[PDB]
């Protein structure tokens, strides 16, 4: 019987700073035990300082990004070139995803950018449109490997102040763009080591008030 | 998930956990399961995340349209029925929702309606909904009285979620507290189970099963 879904593997990662936000994702595309491409980008600049990735089944991922990009275009036409805020984009994407509630887009979507106060914002979606703003989110095949590491390093979970008898927690603080990229790179090298669907290349999109910058890093190709 | 809301002398207490799961994978510990429909109406969320989140924000739009058209805030009965009539149209399609519409109006007073995805709609004083509902019931029922103070009621609702958060594997994260009065709903903070458990264990002397 024809199965309309497939798994294209790969993994994505979004972290939000004080005045910036990053959305990273490996460039490997696979089916079963075969590599389709070592460089197939799945993190996209959608305009209005919104970066987006829809990881999982690449066909549904591409279709969703394509539709959101088009949604941004028509938002400009219908509302006098108004800038689509990240919160408004998130709600719009929920309706896109839930629109196909009974034949879902098989993707974990993450968007990143700046909120209306100029602060870093990451939003994550499930396949059918439930969404939530977070400081931190990993999605895709190696999400289960990366996410607990992020809980520990970004949100300082299970880390107590030394000598305080486990009474005082390690205080939360915003990370610099330099420190965030270190965590992204270490997250992806670790995921590459222990996950077969993750590797080849790492592409990071950084979003500040100035615009959208890109950075690329090699990953192990085995 | 674990959600409860009960009616008492001083209005309505509403309490929920904040965990979201995909099988045995803990997906999130910081989910908002209470929807703020308006200053006098609340809605709780259990079951499918998307179904609850999507249709209860939609419910809020329908309640807004009601007060524009009728120049009057929608009743808790009417609001719950819009939701129950909606999910009933989708009956058999596979929606998964266990919700509670809680609020105050002049004509009704404090009112709680249980509404779920197979079309059940029930008015009542006490309800617990979710995978950890039975754990919350155990603590809530054994300590519930109508004459509870606002302080004691808030604690019991918090303590009942904590009990479920502890025993139920698919509940936890943090407790969100709400109190609904004649003047509207009042938020009573987010309480992380990580700190709350030990705080409760020490001060109350309960949870002796756990290695202190």
């Amino acid at each position: 019987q024809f199965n309309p879904y497939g798994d294209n593997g790969g993994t994505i990662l979004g972290i939000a700073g004080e005045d910036f936000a990053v959305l990273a994702g490996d460039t490997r595309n696979i089916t079963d035990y075969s590599i389709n491409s070592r460089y197939e980008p799945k993190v996209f600049d959608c305009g209005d300082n919104i970066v987006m990735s829809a990881n999982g089944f690449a066909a549904d991922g591409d279709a969703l990004v394509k539709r959101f990009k088009n949604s941004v275009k028509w938002y400009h036409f219908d509302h006098n070139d108004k800038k689509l805020s990240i919160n408004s984009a998130a709600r719009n994407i929920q309706h896109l995803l839930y629109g196909k509630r009974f034949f879902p887009y098989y993707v974990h979507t993450i968007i990143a950018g700046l909120d209306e106060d100029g602060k870093g914002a990451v939003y994550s979606f499930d396949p059918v449109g439930s969404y939530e703003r977070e400081q931190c989110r990993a999605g895709g095949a190696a999400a289960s490997l990366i996410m607990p590491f992020l809980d520990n390093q970004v949100n300082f979970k299970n880390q107590y102040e030394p000598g305080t008898n486990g009474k005082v927690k390690k205080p939360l603080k915003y990370l610099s763009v330099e420190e965030v990229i270190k965590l992204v790179r270490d997250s992806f090298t670790s995921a590459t080591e222990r996950h077969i669907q993750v590797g080849d290349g790492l592409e990071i999109l950084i979003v500040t008030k100035d615009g959208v910058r890109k950075e690329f890093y090699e990953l192990k190709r085995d | 998930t674990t959600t409860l809301a009960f009616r008492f002398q001083g209005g309505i207490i509403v309490a929920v956990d904040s965990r979201a799961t995909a099988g045995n994978w803990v997906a999130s510990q910081t989910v908002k399961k209470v929807i703020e429909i308006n200053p006098f109406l609340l809605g709780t969320m259990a079951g499918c995340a998307a179904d609850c989140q999507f249709w209860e924000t939609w419910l809020g739009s329908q309640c807004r349209l009601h007060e524009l058209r009728e120049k009057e805030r929608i009743s808790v009965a009417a609001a719950s029925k819009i939701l129950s009539n909606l999910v009933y149209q989708y009956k058999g399609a596979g929606l998964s929702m266990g919700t509670m519409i809680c609020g105050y109006t002049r004509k009704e007073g404090p009112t709680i309606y249980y509404v779920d995805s197979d079309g059940t709609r029930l008015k009542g004083d006490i309800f617990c909904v979710g995978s950890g509902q039975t754990f919350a019931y155990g603590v809530l029922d054994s300590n519930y009285k109508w004459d509870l103070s606002v302080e004691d009621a808030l604690y019991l609702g918090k303590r009942s979620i904590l009990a479920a958060a502890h025993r139920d594997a698919y509940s936890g994260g943090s407790v969100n507290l709400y109190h609904v009065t004649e003047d509207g709903w009042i938020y009573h903070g987010n309480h992380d189970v990580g700190e709350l458990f030990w705080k409760v264990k020490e001060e109350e002397g309960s949870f002796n099963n756990v290695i202190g």
Binding site: S130 | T21, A22, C48
Partner: peptide
């Protein structure tokens, strides 16, 4: 399946 879904996310609960």
């Amino acid at each position: 399946x879904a996310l609960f």
